[PDB]
Amino acid sequence: MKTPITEAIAAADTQGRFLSNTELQAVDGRFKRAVASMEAARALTNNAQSLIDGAAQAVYQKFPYTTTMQGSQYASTPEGKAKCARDIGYYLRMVTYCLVAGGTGPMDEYLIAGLSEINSTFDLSPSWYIEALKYIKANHGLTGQAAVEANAYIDYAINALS
Amino acid sequence: MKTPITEAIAAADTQGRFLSNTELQAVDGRFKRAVASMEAARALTNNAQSLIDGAAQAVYQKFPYTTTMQGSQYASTPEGKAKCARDIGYYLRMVTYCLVAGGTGPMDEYLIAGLSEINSTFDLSPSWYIEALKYIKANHGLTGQAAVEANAYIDYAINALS
Amino acid sequence: MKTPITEAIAAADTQGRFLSNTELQAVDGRFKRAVASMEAARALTNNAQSLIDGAAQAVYQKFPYTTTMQGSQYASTPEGKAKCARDIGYYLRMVTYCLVAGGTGPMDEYLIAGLSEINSTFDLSPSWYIEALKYIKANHGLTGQAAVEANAYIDYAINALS
Amino acid sequence: MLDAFAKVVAQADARGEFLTNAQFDALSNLVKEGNKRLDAVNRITSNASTIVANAARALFAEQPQLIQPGGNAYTNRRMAACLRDMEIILRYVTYAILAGDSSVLDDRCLNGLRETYQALGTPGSSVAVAIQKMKDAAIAIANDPNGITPGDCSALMSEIAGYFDRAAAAVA
Amino acid sequence: MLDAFAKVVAQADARGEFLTNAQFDALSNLVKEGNKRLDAVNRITSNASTIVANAARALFAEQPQLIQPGGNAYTNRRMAACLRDMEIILRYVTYAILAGDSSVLDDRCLNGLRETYQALGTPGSSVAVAIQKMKDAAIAIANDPNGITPGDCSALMSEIAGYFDRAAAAVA
Amino acid sequence: MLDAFAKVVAQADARGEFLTNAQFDALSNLVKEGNKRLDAVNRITSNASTIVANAARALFAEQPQLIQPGGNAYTNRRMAACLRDMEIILRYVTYAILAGDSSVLDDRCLNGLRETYQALGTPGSSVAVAIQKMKDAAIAIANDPNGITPGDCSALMSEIAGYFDRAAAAVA
Ligand SMILES: *[C@@H](C)[C@H]1/C(=C/c2[nH]c(/C=C3N=C(/C=C4\NC(=O)C(CC)=C4C)C(C)=C\3CCC(=O)O)c(CCC(=O)O)c2C)NC(=O)[C@@H]1C
Ligand SMILES: *[C@@H](C)[C@H]1/C(=C/c2[nH]c(/C=C3N=C(/C=C4\NC(=O)C(CC)=C4C)C(C)=C\3CCC(=O)O)c(CCC(=O)O)c2C)NC(=O)[C@@H]1C
Ligand SMILES: *[C@@H](C)[C@H]1/C(=C/c2[nH]c(/C=C3N=C(/C=C4\NC(=O)C(CC)=C4C)C(C)=C\3CCC(=O)O)c(CCC(=O)O)c2C)NC(=O)[C@@H]1C
Ligand SMILES: *[C@H](C)[C@H]1/C(=C/c2[nH]c(/C=C3N=C(/C=C4\NC(=O)C(CC)=C4C)C(C)=C\3CCC(=O)O)c(CCC(=O)O)c2C)NC(=O)[C@@H]1C
Numbered sequence A, B, C: 001m002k003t004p005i006t007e008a009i010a011a012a013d014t015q016g017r018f019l020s021n022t023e024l025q026a027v028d029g030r031f032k033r034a035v036a037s038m039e040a041a042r043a044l045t046n047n048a049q050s051l052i053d054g055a056a057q058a059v060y061q062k063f064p065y066t067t068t069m070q071g072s073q074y075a076s077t078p079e080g081k082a083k084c085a086r087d088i089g090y091y092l093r094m095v096t097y098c099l100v101a102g103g104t105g106p107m108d109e110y111l112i113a114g115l116s117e118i119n120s121t122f123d124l125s126p127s128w129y130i131e132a133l134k135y136i137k138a139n140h141g142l143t144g145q146a147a148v149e150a151n152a153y154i155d156y157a158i159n160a161l162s
Numbered sequence D, E, F: 001m002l003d004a005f006a007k008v009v010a011q012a013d014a015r016g017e018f019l020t021n022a023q024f025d026a027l028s029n030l031v032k033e034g035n036k037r038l039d040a041v042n043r044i045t046s047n048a049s050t051i052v053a054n055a056a057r058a059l060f061a062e063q064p065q066l067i068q069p070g071g072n073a074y075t076n077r078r079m080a081a082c083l084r085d086m087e088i089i090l091r092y093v094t095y096a097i098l099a100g101d102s103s104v105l106d107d108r109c110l111n112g113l114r115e116t117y118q119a120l121g122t123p124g125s126s127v128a129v130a131i132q133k134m135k136d137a138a139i140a141i142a143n144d145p146n147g148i149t150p151g152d153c154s155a156l157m158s159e160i161a162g163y164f165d166r167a168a169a170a171v172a
């Protein structure tokens, strides 16, 4: 997985050499920024159920056909509502992992790789997940650097869906 | 082995894709032509012993030294006569296989690959086999498309010996 | 290992072919020169202990700090004197092997590959071994072609240390 | 690869024999029925995306462990690889149907596949089930009586089932 | 490779779980102590050549069979390969210390290494001893109380010893 | 590869020893007899095509199963591969004779060859017989008393037989 720390190590390994002073200061910078990032991840984690619940309802309100139109890809059944809440929770979980890891790597590996193919094969509209992500941004209540970082990962997910 | 059908499949596989309509019509054409080809192969098969016998005698008449000159490469002994009849039967068998498979592939793989090296190492004259092949062409009694196809494979063998 | 004989064989193998007349005459030349070379190697072998002993003392006289300065890399202790005599014997042994094999190959493989790294890591001065090699050249007592060949290998070792 | 014609030729050559009447008759019957083979390949190929996606949905409904976190089809990269494998296997099966011989499927798809899955920790038995679900759907599509000249394709459908079953057996 | 943060994320994802308070607390403590980790990597890296060369001298004093003619470190090519391997292993250990996770060392250094030595006839147990001698020297250097703000780095030194011991155990 | 000189050097180095008088004497005797070695290599090389072709004819007369349809030397591609292998092995044997050491034959020809044939289904025991037939013919040619200064080459012929037998034993 790519993180600021694994990137420093990979650079040294590529050149067959021990780590440089610049590489160590890069990791020091990561350590100093990690404090605020992990606090953001814990705040999102503590509020995850409310954010997931609210985001799902926001999608259903924006796109009412998703709760009536027939088909297993829609949320017209309890099983479909459960799939949708599950997926929204996955996206929020990935945001928290990016905050912990210091970059997009977790979302890249566990969600974005293959995303277009999954949404196509299973007939899932990217617009649904974009609306869920906008709701999360509007309601997570983060401020300062925590908001910059969380919204960076949310906007990155929106870009991947766009 | 290359046949008109395996060539269509190989083209699709090379591009990682399912078969195209043009590829299916190519196989339809093969299926429609296969009728006359297989009839030619059965006629040759039914007459194989007479054709082999006559072809061997045609070689011995054209090249009388092959039945008197001393050496295991010649047909001066019963063992050499048997080797020669065997080889002529191989060539006829290959012609029938080409007719069945719809192309030169069987002859390419089982006879032509390594042919020059075998004839050189074992001191077998290509001219002997060319004469046998000319006799077969003159006496198989095929007509129409059957003759075009059989003689195509015979002439292909002659070219490989030339 | 590269020798005049393995080089001839390698050339033939590279071209997938049997050995040529020129390659056989190259080996004949090697066989004819091998007589004098092996005699040189036996003379050095028979005199090895005196040459090693004298060479070590020559190094200690040229570089007196090697018998007093503190450190395991020096010959200030009995253990260090023994390491030094051992190493000098290695160099002489390699000279005899080159004479037997007809080229630098044994010295290349067993001594020169990695030499710079070993002398650096273990803090061994190349100048020490150059002086030992000069003593051996001055005292082996070889003449004629034997001296040309032995001194070629000694000078080759000096170059590797330079 | 071999097609059905090259396969008989290869069997005959290893025995040093001209084709027997039975071999000639078998190949002539294949050609006589070739239009049905072409319809089957055409119909399966034209519906390939649906066959894969429906079979995948059915697999995961039956084996939800595959899509629970930690399961072998969890994460979009693993799900996409799984969907890709289903499409690959269907593709080589359609080639085998066109050829009338399984060699292309054996040589270019199935050989080594069990060992590949074993090393990944992919459950080969679940891949076998996915193949079986594609089989049933592919046969229903190939054997649909609507929009085609009526006739009996049961022998061909048994052959088709055989190729799918051969794929399933090679990974189970 | 994983660092300590990515490792916790990977463990959480396989369970489909947000991080627990214990995981958050563990990572926060790692960061709180990060200056000590940086000093350890800096100190070991700056003395890497000495750590290798001294450890090699100590190995051969203890195991003279390695440097007798015919021994696995006899000839300058074999000695140089041996010194190189020691430096390689130390290098990957320093990467593991920086990352707070052994994956880089496992994946890019240790995996397959026992089998490599087995095929060469290199005594893996002697490589393990060389690693242990580098361990002791690296910890004494990383944990030197002079020229650094006084504080307790015993937890970090135990972690460092763990990576060296993991390397030794993978070749012994 | 090693020649006879490099082989003695390698044996001596692994023991950390100068050559013994026996080693010096053995190599001096090899050189004293070197003209005979050169004649043997020259004579076998100049007749290589005949040695291969005659040995092949003799093999197939003795083992007609190899050239019955389905046999491992049936088809011109398999026959040509078989003739090629015979020529390859003879070629590496002539290199071993020139070198006075089998290493080139072991390293560049025989190593892995049994396993290659096992995977192909080629009968290694038949390859061994082919090698033996080349051996007998090669020795008769190398040891022909006509057109050469008379002398005793029996020791060399035993060495030559040894290389052929080593090749046969490595595939049987
Ligand atoms: C079993 C699969 C079903 C079935 C098939 C069936 N088809 C025919 C006849 C034809 N099928 C084709 C199709 C093609 N010819 C080509 O060259 C290509 C590739 C471009 C294709 C796809 C054609 C041309 C015919 C002949 C004309 C016609 O439409 O009949 C039959 C009739 C007998 C025969 O073999 O020809 C049958 C039975 N019919 C069913 O009921 C099965 C569900
Ligand atoms: C155990 C290893 C020993 C120990 C370490 C220790 N260090 C500090 C404080 C600091 N260490 C650094 C080092 C770096 N910061 C960087 O960005 C880089 C890369 C360029 C390095 C090498 C710094 C900047 C500090 C803070 C300033 C300072 O010097 O104190 C402590 C104090 C507590 C803390 O974690 O900050 C300690 C305990 N001290 C020992 O006694 C051990 C032998
Ligand atoms: C056993 C193999 C038979 C045998 C050999 C034999 N040869 C000689 C002498 C010579 N052989 C050569 C051949 C070469 N010298 C080269 O440089 C090359 C490569 C181009 C070759 C092929 C030569 C030059 C000689 C010396 C001159 C001569 O013809 O005598 C002997 C004599 C003793 C010796 O070793 O020199 C012998 C015995 N003789 C037999 O009867 C065996 C059948
Ligand atoms: C909610 C916004 C809308 C909704 C959701 C819905 N999703 C599915 C099925 C799937 N969702 C995924 C998503 C992921 N799987 C992963 O591993 C990851 C990364 C960790 C993600 C983002 C996948 C792969 C599927 C298909 C496989 C599965 O079922 O798990 C469905 C069911 C689809 C079906 O046809 O059965 C639904 C309903 N649909 C709506 O209408 C909501 C607005």
Ligand SMILES: *[C@H](C)[C@H]1/C(=C/c2[nH]c(/C=C3N=C(/C=C4\NC(=O)C(CC)=C4C)C(C)=C\3CCC(=O)O)c(CCC(=O)O)c2C)NC(=O)[C@@H]1C
Pocket: B059, B060, B066, B067, B071, B072, B073, B074, B075, B076, B079, B080, B081, B083, B084, B085, B087, B088, B090, B091, B110, B111, B118, B122, B124, B128, B129, B132, F057, F060, F067, F073, F074, F075, F076, F079
């Ligand atoms: C007949 C026209 C003349 C004749 C024939 C003859 N052939 C051989 C020996 C061989 N013939 C082949 C040919 C093939 N083997 C294959 O696998 C194939 C493809 C399927 C072919 C075409 C080969 C390989 C050999 C050598 C090995 C073997 O014996 O099977 C001989 C005997 C040669 C010998 O020296 O023993 C003969 C006599 N010779 C004539 O004079 C006829 C006019």
Ligand SMILES: *[C@H](C)[C@H]1/C(=C/c2[nH]c(/C=C3N=C(/C=C4\NC(=O)C(CC)=C4C)C(C)=C\3CCC(=O)O)c(CCC(=O)O)c2C)NC(=O)[C@@H]1C
Pocket: C059, C060, C066, C067, C071, C072, C073, C074, C075, C076, C079, C080, C081, C083, C084, C085, C087, C088, C090, C091, C110, C111, C118, C122, C124, C128, C129, C132, E057, E060, E067, E073, E074, E075, E076, E079
């Ligand atoms: C003598 C001229 C001076 C001297 C020698 C000395 N050498 C060492 C240690 C080593 N010497 C070698 C040399 C070789 N090893 C090989 O395999 C080969 C090729 C066959 C060679 C040339 C090596 C590898 C070492 C290090 C490993 C070992 O101890 O064997 C020492 C001891 C170094 C130490 O720190 O322990 C000494 C003293 N030193 C002098 O002052 C003499 C003038």
Ligand SMILES: *[C@H](C)[C@H]1/C(=C/c2[nH]c(/C=C3N=C(/C=C4\NC(=O)C(CC)=C4C)C(C)=C\3CCC(=O)O)c(CCC(=O)O)c2C)NC(=O)[C@@H]1C
Pocket: D066, D071, D072, D073, D077, D078, D079, D081, D082, D083, D085, D086, D088, D089, D108, D109, D110, D113, D116, D120, D122, D123, D126, D127, D130
């Ligand atoms: C889906 C039903 C199941 C599933 C599948 C799955 N497969 C992989 C990875 C690979 N699949 C293959 C198969 C092929 N590659 C080819 O080129 C061909 C034709 C010759 C085949 C048949 C290979 C080679 C791999 C590994 C390399 C790659 O990924 O491209 C995965 C990924 C596993 C991982 O951990 O990365 C998965 C998930 N998983 C299930 O749960 C279903 C039962």
Ligand SMILES: *[C@H](C)[C@H]1/C(=C/c2[nH]c(/C=C3N=C(/C=C4\NC(=O)C(CC)=C4C)C(C)=C\3CCC(=O)O)c(CCC(=O)O)c2C)NC(=O)[C@@H]1C
Pocket: E066, E071, E072, E073, E077, E078, E079, E081, E082, E083, E085, E086, E088, E089, E108, E109, E110, E113, E116, E120, E122, E123, E126, E127, E130
């Ligand atoms: C030194 C303590 C011991 C010793 C070591 C020794 N190693 C080799 C050869 C190899 N070592 C490796 C190890 C690696 N190569 C890499 O790239 C990495 C990082 C992934 C590692 C860990 C490899 C691959 C080899 C073989 C290829 C090569 O030499 O580069 C030797 C040489 C053995 C020989 O006979 O040539 C030696 C001597 N030997 C001892 O006696 C010490 C116990």
Ligand SMILES: *[C@H](C)[C@H]1/C(=C/c2[nH]c(/C=C3N=C(/C=C4\NC(=O)C(CC)=C4C)C(C)=C\3CCC(=O)O)c(CCC(=O)O)c2C)NC(=O)[C@@H]1C
Pocket: F066, F071, F072, F073, F077, F078, F079, F081, F082, F083, F085, F086, F088, F089, F108, F109, F110, F113, F116, F120, F122, F123, F126, F127, F130
């Ligand atoms: C002849 C006496 C027997 C025989 C031989 C036969 N061999 C093959 C195929 C191969 N032979 C080799 C051997 C080598 N290749 C090299 O480069 C070297 C030097 C390092 C050697 C010794 C190899 C590698 C192969 C496989 C690859 C290739 O064909 O080039 C065949 C072909 C088998 C097939 O089915 O294709 C045959 C027939 N067969 C007999 O019956 C004789 C006993």
Ligand SMILES: CCCCNc1ccc(C(=O)OCCN(C)C)cc1
Pocket: D062, D063, D064, D065, D066, D123, D126, D129
């Ligand atoms: C990782 C593999 C776990 C897949 N989970 C399941 C496996 C098997 C079953 C199951 O009950 O299957 C029985 C019938 N045949 C078709 C398999 C149900 C779930």
Ligand SMILES: CCCCNc1ccc(C(=O)OCCN(C)C)cc1
Pocket: E062, E063, E064, E065, E066, E123, E126, E129
């Ligand atoms: C080729 C390997 C031979 C190395 N020689 C020796 C091996 C072991 C010992 C030895 O006594 O070691 C015991 C203690 N632990 C650390 C190993 C001493 C010498």
Ligand SMILES: CCCCNc1ccc(C(=O)OCCN(C)C)cc1
Pocket: F062, F063, F064, F065, F066, F123, F126, F129
């Ligand atoms: C595929 C291998 C079949 C080869 N056929 C034969 C094998 C062996 C024999 C045979 O009788 O050999 C006994 C003597 N030694 C030299 C083998 C005769 C024929």
